[PDB]
């Protein structure tokens, strides 16, 4: 036995652990539709930071991460479809793929109460519910045949390993913002946020074709990586009105696509830059989403926030220019990205070649296992990289 | 000589007079394409009531109405689609069909400066911008060939008048929160508002093949005309929670399709029924659709409201459960209906007899023009009739 | 032990025989995936009919049937959504749930090699591949969790078992047909066939709230189950042109929408009514649907005929007015139906009394395990009858 | 003065000649909604080459020619969104943007009877009907609000005028074949064909973010524009199975969409390459998309061939794997493309910079009127050229 894991212990206090070497087993029933991984690659992310900072409650001892490639290195008697030595990507959706929302490919939001008894949706390292994350040298996943991502040839594979970590989560998941928010060949797109999530949903609307990417952030570190990768930027703590800024770049005051990209700890615009406000993100699509456009929300909105702003952000409830956009007539979409409706096509444009703007835009940094608090740490105090964690060491040495 | 209008002068000061004949003409600028009617039939709508209340401000003087039957009596010179005495209806929304979003099939949100100099969207009697209402003997219509509907055998349109003058406005518009919100055959629906567009939402819903639906509303008479055509209703008096009322008729205390018939003037639930919330039918909405599902907002929402019922509310700025309705990946579709996308389906769905229930739930009642201001004061109080103004005796059925 | 079952023997020759129950096994294998149910309706279908012609081949000594109905008696250790005695649909394709097209909702060609090694799709009784058909008293169901559609109340789905037994295959097929071919509401819709696929087809477009359902058969007591029921119907022994009997029906000579609910041992129009002729049903409906219009085709096309009316239908190879249809902009749908995609809400719309039509049209006729090989040869002999063959006599008696 | 046209007196008889000035005029009637141009740009295409080889009849003395760039210069009285010297594309569609179909963005499918009296479907140079082509001096465009794009940036549109005078045409047409088979980013794309329509769709699916585009010719120099611009070709002149040749480039002999840019001359593969035969594409493409997969066939199907291959071919009935096809459920769009519905985001694609590769794998050749007859003798003859025929000398770019 023996697994080493980023262990959640209070507010900023991660603490890198051995704990028990993970069973087929889940609340004392076998699975035998599950795998155990040796884990290759494990990100960081900006929900991970929701958990670090305080603001997403999981129980003391939660294992965290949801960023998962690894190895097949045991499986029950009903995996029929990986082998061991698989190497393969994880969704971060814990889904079943046996009820109803998983057969009509909605595993964003599995009714399975065997995956989550409590709500509709799974998630590792989010105790949604009680699968352990994945920031570890080994995992537990349930539903591994309809789970788990294949990656056909190992040596390819893992000469792009930088790109291929990001398709269990964050990739299709910027992906999924642009897409449902109608982003195709020759769009104009705004996108909120220039953290590793609106990074990628940068790079993803530039696969989709789309004509002008305009990214919004306060941090100017983030929004270089993407400035010098040739997408056009926008500083929020210019104190002229974000139309009037895009009208700068664009020809237009508008844009055909809104993607949110930073969910309920959103900061202000100008003056309001350094202060927190949930509905900062949102109010800003409203605003410079032109009539007949849509907008896709990949950034995480909460329905109870343990430390919030004001009063109504504690209970979900948030200020949003509803009447504004209504007048527009924009469609808006919400929710978990689907993951496993995106990472096969995702996949098959990084082999192929498709996204070379993509470790460009992403500035991926290699930690160890022991180093991740301090990773953690360094991305809590906005960081451009993007962390992700080799356990193993077998990602050579950059 | 001169045209008898329903005339705005002020809050709940309506006057039926004489206004000058309409004119080919626009801003004083010649109109080609354009047409004038002899109204048929002119309903009277809520959105006619926002306005009647002050809640939707309009110059004095604007002529209101946008729920028009008529038949075409003088034409320009680019009017190729259209003869003499054709009989016609009228789209609520003014639409060139010549720019960008008319083109893209999206005539709810026209661009054209020449329709409305500031915002992308037309419409009658809301000046929008400078176009008169319908709820007249005469009114102006541009861009005919692309804006009417003309109906083919007249004969047999005006045998179903009473259900084909809702093909304007509110059967197009319940049935594209419908369509809007996924609405199909097997489909459980939740229906907030039982005024005409919540029963046409109701009606259409039906049409679509939905298994159950369920229409709630405060108001007893409204939702009577529902349960006698065999539709389920929820009394939104009652104290108990709405997902819990929603289980005790489903079985499930969730639905895959909300819509929101009742706008910006909602009421609250239970003993807050006598109270006007804004969020009042969102955020029911918000609670009551289940993961995966989506909601259609056919009521209006506005930017700005002259007497809101909180400072927020008076920048069109809701206290919304936004979080609660991202945890579940909702899509929200929002805005006025693009009427042509739904009338000539529609309009063949009435007359090869697929919609015996819409006279059952609509209650029309036909009024002339000078009852029309008494119609606007019942309509006002919860009256559960569609009023129907006939200015030149042409319906005579009851 | 003991299973008696229809055996396929030769060309129309069926034979009912007791063979051993079956067990959780597929090719050697244990599978603990996979339920054992006991029959409790299963029916006699066209393409079995296929079959019982020498049309389609299957191993001698193969069962037949893939209309199951059944109750849970025996489970895997991974079966965790179905319990023993309860009441399921089983869709007519094997499918795994866990392949590519299977998580991307297309489980009507499963590409899991253990479900069929020779082609990307799974039958009962189609030996498609080795899996026993259901015209038996016992039959082996794989992958139950994800293939399965539970009947959540017994008594309810048993007092419309007669509905409910079509919702394995043929309601879903010609609904199917309907929604690939853009059926909506308002619709004009000509339907090829009046089999029990033409008639679901029939009853799928009426739910889907079609404004005109035109049915064409050379059989004259087939479409009188239709006619009877409300629905337009043309015999195709007329010799006037198929575009002017419906002009004669609609005022227009073609349609919106087209079903093909033949397939390839299809018969002229006209004097060629006793013709086959593989291209009668396709080309009569490339004829008929408009410009911008859509095809479904839910009838059945192979790759390969043992027994054509020409050498070219020998290979799949039809001569078809392919010009004609491509001139008109016309979008095509093929293929077996995705049940699983449909069976929920369809079973929905049933439970809640949306289609009482349904029965009236279908003309079910409910006969025993040994009466079969009757129901077949009368089916053969253009039998306006819907057979569903009750084995253990749990359908009371009629 | 007289209006110097390429006019069409018989097979392989073109001749440039003074026509009289286009008129604002139609059969005798006077148009409103009309516009002349001075013609800037004017390509030769494929579908010009069916009529220039007598396989698709227009009149003697047809002006040719469907792939208009031009500037406004004279407009009648209802153009109120062009001015004089706004340089505009004209879609090759004849659109009214006025009845149903126009009004369903199927502008590829005008059923204006003033557009085309018998067809429902209008286009320049075919007589569809009673259009004079754009190989011309100056052209008379209809409807032109509804029909002309305007590109906003006069001088930034002309110095991308190779890449834009793709916009009225082939561009949207490879484009829409892509998008009508589902291509999107990830995706596995075969082409049929390597003339200028063909290497639009590759163009297209690279712009949509396909990993592996490949595209099959019997035509060598052709084909190499595509090699040197990075993308996959098959020399169609090679015996192997094109299943298997495209097993040596993909990893599998199957892909996701299939694009058939040939038509109705099509030729063989391998030992049959130049032997003419009208299924050729069309069978390719049912062998070798995937189960599940879709097909755009953008190429030429007619109703009618006055000089085809077999006497089935001469009345648009061809010899189809419609077996092998429907048991993969296979999806078919066909058709005119609606030029409209992607002309907008294309230019924006093309203005930002987007499509590179576009003039890369195009070859674009700009010739006079005078030599417009010895274009379509050399494009006749297999030349790897896109001709632009230049009126006024107002490109002078090469
Ligand atoms: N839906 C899903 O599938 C899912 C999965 C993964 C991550 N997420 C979410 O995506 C979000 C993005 O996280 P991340 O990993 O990119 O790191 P992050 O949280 O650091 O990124 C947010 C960035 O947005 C910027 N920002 C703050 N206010 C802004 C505003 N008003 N307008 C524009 N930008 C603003 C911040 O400076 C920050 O750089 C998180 O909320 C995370 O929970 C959701
Ligand atoms: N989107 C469009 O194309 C468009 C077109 C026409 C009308 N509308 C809008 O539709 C809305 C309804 O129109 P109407 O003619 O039925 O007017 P209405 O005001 O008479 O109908 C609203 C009904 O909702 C009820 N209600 C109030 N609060 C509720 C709650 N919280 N939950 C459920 N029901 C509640 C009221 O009792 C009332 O009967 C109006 O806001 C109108 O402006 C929009
Ligand atoms: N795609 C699927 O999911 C799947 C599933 C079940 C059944 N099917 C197929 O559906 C088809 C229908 O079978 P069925 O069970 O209704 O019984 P059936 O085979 O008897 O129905 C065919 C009917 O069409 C009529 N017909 C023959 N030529 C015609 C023509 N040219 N135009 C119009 N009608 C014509 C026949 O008289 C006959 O009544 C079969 O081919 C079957 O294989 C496909
Ligand atoms: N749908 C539309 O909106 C529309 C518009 C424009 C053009 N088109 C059509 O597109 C087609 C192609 O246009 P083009 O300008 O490229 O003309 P083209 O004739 O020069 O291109 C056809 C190419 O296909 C090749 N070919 C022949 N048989 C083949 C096969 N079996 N498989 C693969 N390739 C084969 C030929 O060698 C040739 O290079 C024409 O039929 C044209 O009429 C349609
Ligand atoms: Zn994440
Ligand atoms: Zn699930
Ligand atoms: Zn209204
Ligand atoms: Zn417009
Ligand atoms: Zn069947
Ligand atoms: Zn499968
Ligand atoms: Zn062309
Ligand atoms: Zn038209």
Chains 1, 2, 3, 4 share one sequence.
Not at 19 to 40: D, F, G, M, S, T
Not at 115 to 137: M, R, Y
Not at 278 to 293: E, K
Not at 368 to 376: E, F, I, V
Request: proline letters at 5%.
């Amino acid at each position: 036995a023996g697994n080493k894991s980023v262990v959640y212990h209070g507010t900023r206090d991660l603490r890198v652990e051995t704990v028990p070497y993970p069973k087929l087993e889940h609340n004392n029933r076998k699975l035998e539709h599950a795998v155990i991984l040796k884990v290759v690659s494990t990100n960081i992310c900006g929900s991970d930071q929701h958990i670090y900072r305080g603001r997403f409650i999981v129980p003391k001892g939660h294992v965290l991460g949801h960023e998962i490639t690894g190895e097949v290195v045991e499986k029950g008697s009903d995996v029929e479809l990986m082998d061991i030595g698989d190497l393969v990507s994880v969704p971060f959706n814990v889904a079943c793929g046996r009820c109803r929302n998983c057969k009509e490919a909605r595993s964003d939001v599995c009714e399975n109460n065997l995956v989550n008894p409590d709500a509709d949706l799974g998630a590792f390292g989010f105790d949604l519910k009680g699968w352990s994350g994945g920031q570890a040298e080994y995992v537990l996943v349930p539903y591994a045949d309809y789970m788990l991502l294949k990656f056909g040839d190992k040596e390819q594979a893992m000469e792009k390993i930088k790109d291929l970590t990001l398709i269990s989560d964050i990739l299709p998941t910027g992906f999924h913002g642009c897409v449902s928010a109608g982003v195709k060949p020759g769009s104009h797109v705004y996108i909120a946020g220039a953290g590793p999530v609106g990074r990628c949903a940068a790079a993803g609307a530039r696969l989709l074709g789309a004509a002008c990417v305009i990214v919004g952030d306060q941090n100017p570190e983030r929004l270089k990586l993407l400035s010098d990768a040739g997408f056009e930027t926008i500083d929020l703590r210019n104190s002229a009105p974000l139309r009037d800024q895009i009208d700068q770049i664009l020809g237009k005051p508008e844009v055909d696509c809104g993607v949110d990209a930073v969910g309920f700890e959103a900061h202000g615009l100008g003056d309001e830059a350094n202060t927190e406000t949930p509905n900062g993100a949102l109010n800003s699509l409203f605003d410079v989403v032109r009539a007949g456009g849509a907008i896709g929300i990949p950034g995480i909105y909460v329905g109870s926030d343990p430390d919030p702003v004001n009063k109504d952000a504690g209970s979900g409830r948030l200020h949003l220019d509803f009447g504004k956009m209504w007048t527009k007539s924009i469609r808006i979409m919400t929710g978990m990205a689907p993951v496993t409706n995106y990472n096969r096509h995702l996949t098959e444009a990084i082999l192929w070649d498709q996204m070379p703007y993509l470790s460009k835009v992403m500035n991926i940094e290699v930690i160890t296992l022991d180093q991740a608090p301090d990773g953690y740490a360094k991305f809590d105090k906005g960081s451009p990289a993007k962390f992700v964690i080799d356990p193993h060491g077998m990602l050579k040495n950059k």
